[PDB]
Amino acid sequence: PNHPLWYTLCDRYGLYVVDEANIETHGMVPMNRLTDDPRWLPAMSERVTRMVQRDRNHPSVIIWSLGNESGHGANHDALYRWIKSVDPSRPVQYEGGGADTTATDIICPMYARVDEDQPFPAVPKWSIKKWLSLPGETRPLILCEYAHAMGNSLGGFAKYWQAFRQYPRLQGGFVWDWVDQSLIKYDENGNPWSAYGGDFGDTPNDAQFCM
C-alpha cells in the first residue's frame, strides 16, 4: 500500500490503480512455504484486510492485489475469497503460483512473452496469445510486469502492443518499472554520484538489479 496521498492524486489526476497488499516471501523455498502455512494466515490476513479497510473508498483503485511473489498457498485462496465477499466492486488479482490460479480473476503473468512459450515446470509462462486459449481458460490477461526496463532495454516493446491491440482479451500490462532505485553518494569533493547494490558495503547484494 502506498503513502495515502498517492491515491488522492490518482483520484484527481486520473490513473487506474492496482492496490497491493504488503506481502512478498520471494526468498522462501519453496516460494509458498509460508503462504500455505495456516500459522501465517493471521499475519497475512491483516496485510490484506487492513489495506481494503483503508483504501476501499478511492475510485482510482480498480483492482485489489494479494501481494507479490509468494507462490500460491491456501492462505491466498482464503484471502481472495475474503475480498470478493467484502468488496465485490473490484476484481482481485495475484500472480503467484503460475499467474492463473484460483486466487486471481485476471491472468496476470510477469514477463510472459508475446509469441514464445517458456515451459517452466509447475509454473510455465505461456506466450500470452496462447495462454488466453488454453482449454477452459476464459479470463482476461493483463501482465502485472513486463518489458523489464533495466539499462539499455525495452527491445521488443512494440510486439506487445501489436498483440494487445489485436487480441480483445489481451488488455495490456504494467511495465517494470517506473524509476531506477539508485541512491546518491558523494565523492571526496562532495560531488554526488548514483550508487546501486553493494556501494554501501552491503553484502551479499544484487548490484545494478535495483535500477
Q: Which does 100 bind (CB under 5 to 8 A by kind): Na ion, ligand IPT, none?
A: none
* Dist. CA 49–CA 42, nearest whole Å: 10
Residue type, position 116, single letter? E
Q: How far does CA 140 lie from the centroid of its chain?
A: 16
CB 124 within 8 A of CB 109: no
Q: Which does 66 bind (CB under 5 to 8 A by kind): Na ion, ligand IPT, none?
A: none
Give the annotated binding-site residues for Na(+).
209
Question: 154 — alpha (psi -120 to 50), left (phi > 0) or beta?
Answer: left
Cell readout for 143 is 501482465
Closer of 164 and 196 to Na ion (Cβ): 164
Of 107, 170, 173, 197, the residue at the interface with Na ion (CB under 5 A) is 170
* Dist. CA 6–CA 68, nearest whole Å: 20
19 binds ligand IPT (CB under 6 A): no
* Dist. CA 188–CA 179, nearest whole Å: 27
209 binds ligand IPT (CB under 6 A): yes
Binding mask 93-132 for ligand IPT (x = CB under 6 A): -----------------x----------------------
CB 79 within 8 A of CB 66: yes
Name the closest residue to ligand IPT (Cβ). 209
* Dist. CA 91–CA 62, nearest whole Å: 7
Site for ligand IPT in 39-98 (CB under 6 A): none
Give the annotated binding-site residues for Mg(2+).
24, 26, 69, 205
CB 99 within 8 A of CB 107: yes
208 binds Na ion (CB under 5 A): no
Decide if 137 is catalytic: no
Of 145, 147, 164, 196, the residue at the interface with ligand IPT (CB under 6 A) is 145
CB of 108 to ligand IPT, least distance (A): 12
Q: What residue has cell string 500470452?
A: 128
Give the annotated binding-site residues for substrate.
69, 145-148
Residues annotated as catalytic are 69, 145
Residues of the shown chain interacting with ligand IPT in the complex, contacts defined by CB under 6 A = 110, 145, 209
Residues of the shown chain interacting with Na ion in the complex, contacts defined by CB under 5 A = 164, 167, 170, 209
